Design a protein around this nucleic acid. Sequence first.
DNA 1: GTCA
Length: 293
Amino acid sequence: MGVHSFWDIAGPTARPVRLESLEDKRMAVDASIWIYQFSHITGFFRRICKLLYFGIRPVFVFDGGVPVLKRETIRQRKTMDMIKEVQELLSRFGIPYITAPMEAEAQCAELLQLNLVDGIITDDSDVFLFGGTKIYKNMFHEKNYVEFYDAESILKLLGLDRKNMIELAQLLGSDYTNGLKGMGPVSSIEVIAEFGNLKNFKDWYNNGQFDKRKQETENKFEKDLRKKLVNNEIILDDDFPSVMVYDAYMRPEVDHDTTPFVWGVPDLDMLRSFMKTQLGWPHEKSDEILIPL
DNA sequence: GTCA
């Protein structure tokens, strides 16, 4: 997920962290993203166990609904009784969960900004756009280490602040915008490097679009860029950059609740029962995995 | 370099 291929750009700044080092950390986890995949009880259970195995204290976050901007965009790119059975599993695991007003990602970012969590576990790079600043990526790949990302390293090493990343999304694409046809990680980062921002990029493109001369006296990088935008027949309007896309990312609907989370030990019997009730499990299988933790 |  995320600004399409934004992870490609943020990429060079990742720093590998052993999962052992995460012991005792309060971590926001976007639950809705998991439900949108996972059978739905099995995946949760495995992932939850990996989490607890390493001593992570997770807070699961759920969507309170999908904003209109996100609905349109996903559709174009092409029971909730499952959500209950999973909050059942969580509660029986002692793990707290909240339902956000709108987006789990944006809410997750707010938990970090309020010191209710230490980091965000996510593979959705839109979390940077909503202002998330301490991201753990590839938590459920089969590895012993995870990739750590923070907004400061991105700032110092790449020269990209939060506004820059929202404008990167309007080139690359994301949960809110399709980006521009023909634009990927490298064209997009270079457009920001050359013009600083999208207004100067639109201006450069409209001012030379029919002025016969400037097009022949342009740098090579420009000459190739103009070509690609024209091949794709792109119209840079007064709608570009989008003010509403900027607004959805900069001020999303979020729950300023400042009440610290509480974590309980799991319950070895409520879980063994649970899995039997639903997944046709024995108390042998259940106990063998859990009891260690 | 950008997409199956």
